[PDB]
Amino acid sequence: KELNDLEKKYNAHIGVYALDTKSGKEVKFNSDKRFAYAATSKAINSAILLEQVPYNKLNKKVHINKDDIVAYSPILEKYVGKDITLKALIEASMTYSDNTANNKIIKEIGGIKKVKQRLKELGDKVTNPVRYEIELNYYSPKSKKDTSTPAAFGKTLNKLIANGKLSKENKKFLLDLMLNNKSGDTLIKDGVPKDYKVADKSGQAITYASRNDVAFVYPKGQSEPIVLVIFTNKDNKSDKPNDKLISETAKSVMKEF
Numbered sequence: 001k002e003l004n005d006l007e008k009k010y011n012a013h014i015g016v017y018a019l020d021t022k023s024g025k026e027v028k029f030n031s032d033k034r035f036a037y038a039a040t041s042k043a044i045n046s047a048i049l050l051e052q053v054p055y056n057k058l059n060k061k062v063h064i065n066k067d068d069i070v071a072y073s074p075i076l077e078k079y080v081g082k083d084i085t086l087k088a089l090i091e092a093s094m095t096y097s098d099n100t101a102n103n104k105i106i107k108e109i110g111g112i113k114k115v116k117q118r119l120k121e122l123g124d125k126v127t128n129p130v131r132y133e134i135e136l137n138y139y140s141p142k143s144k145k146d147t148s149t150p151a152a153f154g155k156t157l158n159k160l161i162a163n164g165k166l167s168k169e170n171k172k173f174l175l176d177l178m179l180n181n182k183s184g185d186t187l188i189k190d191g192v193p194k195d196y197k198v199a200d201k202s203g204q205a206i207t208y209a210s211r212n213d214v215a216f217v218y219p220k221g222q223s224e225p226i227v228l229v230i231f232t233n234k235d236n237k238s239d240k241p242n243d244k245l246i247s248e249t250a251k252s253v254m255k256e257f
Contacts, residue, residue, distance in 0.1 A: 001252045003029045010245040012209065015231040017150035020257050021162050022224035027256045031151040034126075035231030036139030036210040038203030039097045040153070041129065041146075043214060045105045046090050046174060047160040048118050052109070055169035058087040062104065071134050073100035087173075094177040094201065099133035106132065122159045126152030139205040139233075153214065154229040162216060162227055175199045175216065186243040187213040188228060191250035195220030204241065209234040211241030213250075219257065226257055 007014050015035050018027040053060070061083040069077060075092035076084070077100070086108065093101035109115055112129050119127050127148035130136070136146040148156075160166075161174065178199035189198040200215035210233045216225040230246050230253075 001248070003249060003252060006245065006249055006252065009248075010242060012232050012234045012241075012245050014245070014249055015150040015229075016249060016253060017154035017229045018226060018253050018256070019154055019158055019228075020224070020226040021158060022222060025257065027253050028151065031154075032149050034144060034147040034149050035212065035233055036137070036146055036205040036207070037127070037148050037153060037231065038137055038139075038146075038205040038210060038212060039102075040201050040203040040212050040214045040229075041127075041136070042093045042097060042102050042105075042203075043174075043178070043201040044119075044127070044153075044156060044160065045102060045109065045115065046093060047157075047164075047166065048109050048115060049086070049090070049105050050170040050174060051160075051165050053086060053170075055167060055173065058090075058173075059085050061085050062089070062108065064100070064104065068100055068104060070099045070103060070132070073098050076100035076104075090174070091177060094174070095181055095183075097183065097203075103132050119156060122156055122164075124148075124152050124156045124159075127156055134206075137204075137206040139207045139210050141208065141233075150229040150231050153231075154227050157214060157216075157229070158227045162225055178216065184213055184215075187246040188215045188217065188230065188250040190243070191247035192217055192254050193220075196254070199225075207237050209236075209239035209241040211243065211246065213246050217254070228253065 015030040092098035184200040184202040197218040
């Protein structure tokens with residue numbers, strides 16, 4: 001189904017970038033338009049850390065104190081005054097979209113500045129990390145803060161994860177978390193065929209019904225994934241998102257492969 005029709009039906013804006021890493025075939029629709037990426041960036045942050053810490057060293061611990069805690073940290077809030085391994089920081093951020101786990105991960109990498117430097121190195125001059133959780137969710141269409149375009153984000157996920165410098169172990173670890181995440185079930189996972197394995201990370205900013213999902217979709221029989229980025233927003237600050245838009249956009253898009 002035409003994506004413009006999907007936009008029409010949902011009165012939302014859609015940004016898609018799909019890349020079948022086996023063939024190199026790309027599907028694009030508003031792929032160079034900026035969207036607040038929200039929690040989908042957790043995938044990017046976790047992957048950058050895993051480039052620098054071998055699987056075996058994920059047992060290393062970090063101390064968490066009261067200053068680390070930000071809103072919506074279902075796992076990390078129980079860790080004040082305690083220490084936590086890097087493994088569990090990643091599991092929390094990925095599976096529960098723990099905000100404190102994410103910020104901590106960023107801190108471990110060296111700060112936002114270091115994350116930006118690494119995106120530039122991968123050739124991504126678009127994805128613009130500026131704020132930490134949860135401020136990164138205050139999206140304003142008039143601001144480039146914490147936004148990326150589906151094409152940029154999608155090329156970065158491909159380079160970081162689908163075909164980057166991660167070991168076997170750390171790739172499996174990150175992907176298993178994305179495959180089992182129950183939070184993206186009403187999204188990409190909901191619109192692709194049941195044959196398809198979907199490893200995703202969703203996100204939702206506070207404003208303009210900014211709702212997203214990024215995934216590594218593995219068609220039945222294909223070991224190479226298809227990287228799929230779906231960013232969506234609406235015109236009003238207070239609009240609520242309808243997850244069916246992402247489910248349907250994914251369904252349309254999968255027909256191209």
